[PDB]
Ligand binder design. Structure first.
Ligand SMILES: Nc1ncnc2c(CN3C[C@H](CSc4ccc(Cl)cc4)[C@@H](O)C3)c[nH]c12
Ligand SMILES: Nc1ncnc2c(CN3C[C@H](CSc4ccc(Cl)cc4)[C@@H](O)C3)c[nH]c12
Ligand SMILES: [Mg+2]
Ligand SMILES: [Mg+2]
Lengths: 230, 230
């Protein structure tokens, strides 16, 4: 089968991936990351956590593509909810992603826009449709929406309101847009899957600490169900 | 000699590099970038502009290392001044770089800090010392200081004051910390050289437009003088 890269940002997001897949992994260090290489259902899987934020995740995704030759990238992890219908533990796939902290307004560019790029980065319609079909068959809600990514943990009503008003984002995290961006630049199909850990508000830190483990597991289990169909 | 990667962020920052080196270049596309491969003074040189910002520059630096096998990376371009003694056209090398827009304060981390990383990223003491020796011999001032990098063009007194107070930064740009970070992760020596284009204040946009071409040339000419000693 096709070689699949599987990414999280934090070790906690990939621990359930390694456990749920349950196969033997070889650990390969490169560029400050540890890549776990295994075989699952006749497919090579490469699993890593990037470390937090846009630079870390850009580097790790580029390494996955250039050094390991992955043919698709599936990102699994947690996110903050920006919409009332995404509750703790709920899943979404990002149809589009934006770097919400990019600001070239001094040159009259829209927020999120960089010359020679675009505000919104697309993911794989095929992988997103597969996710939705699995969610429907398993009787779980799966939102499809915009994810905003930046290098700040969002924990205020004011910043939430900006993300909703400026980008119509449904969730916020720190890595999805960079992962999807790298994949687009190399022509590699990408899916970004997140489970809600908090509401990105004043109490988000406490909610994140409480729900990281469960939400990371919810996303990882769903990612595995996608790989089972690939 | 050793294979050298030479990076700018904007096409305008590498146009003088290609012209000043004056050799034949082969254009090689990869990952949305165009790499210009030439031979200069018995050294292979790979020149590219990354496009603006942290994600673009992280990707291009990773490609330079993984796909082209560069053994050192020299970054050349322009920057906004945060200190009175760095005037338009003046040069500095970054002794350390910080991602000034990283904010994990919700988890009680210092600004700029990411777990499993550090606030300040180091560059090559050898390359920085070479730069200083060349500047002294050529009778030009060369500051050695902290450069702050983020995904916003800085154009306000308030943000300048934050960068100086929080990080003691001397200049601000959008790519240096990410380039230096990637190089550190792969063990590749890095030097980040910038020429001042503006004062990062309310009028920075107009100053940048006026001085981009000259400042980019000043940095490129100095970078070439470093390569002449390598
Ligand atoms: N409200 C929010 N804002 C941004 N990102 C996230 C995420 C997703 N990721 C989790 C993780 C949050 S930053 C952090 C720092 C130190 C420590 Cl010890 C625990 C967490 C980042 O990889 C983004 C969940 N909620 C978020
Ligand atoms: N005050 C400042 N703040 C941040 N970065 C810089 C830089 C360095 N780079 C130049 C370039 C500024 S962003 C931009 C966008 C659209 C257009 Cl058409 C022209 C410029 C980025 O690669 C950062 C110089 N001054 C800066
Ligand atoms: Mg594409
Ligand atoms: Mg080192």
């Amino acid at each position: 089968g096709q070689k699949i890269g599987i990414l999280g940002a934090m070790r906690e997001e990939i621990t359930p991936i390694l456990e749920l897949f349950g196969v033997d992994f070889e650990e390969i260090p490169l560029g400050g990351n540890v890549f776990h290489k295994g075989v699952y259902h006749n497919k090579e899987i490469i699993v890593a956590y990037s470390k937090i934020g846009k630079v870390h995740s850009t580097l790790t995704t580029t390494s996955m593509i250039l050094a390991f030759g992955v043919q698709k990238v599936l990102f699994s992890g947690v996110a903050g909810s920006l919409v009332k219908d995404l509750k703790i533990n709920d899943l979404l796939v990002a149809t589009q992603l934006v770097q919400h902290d990019v600001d070239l307004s001094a040159f009259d560019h829209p927020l999120g826009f960089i010359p020679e790029s675009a505000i919104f980065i697309e993911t794989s319609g095929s992988l997103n449709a597969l996710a939705k079909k699995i969610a429907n068959e398993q009787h779980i809600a799966l939102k499809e929406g915009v994810i905003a990514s930046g290098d700040q943990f969002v924990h205020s009503k004011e910043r939430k309101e900006f993300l909703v008003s400026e980008f119509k984002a449904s969730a916020v995290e720190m890595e999805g847009a960079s992962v999807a961006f790298v994949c687009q630049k190399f022509g590699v199909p990408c899916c970004v899957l997140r489970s809600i850990s908090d509401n990105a508000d004043e109490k988000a830190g406490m909610s994140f600490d409480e729900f990281l483990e469960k939400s990371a597991h919810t996303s990882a289990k769903f990612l595995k169900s996608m790989v089972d169909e690939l």
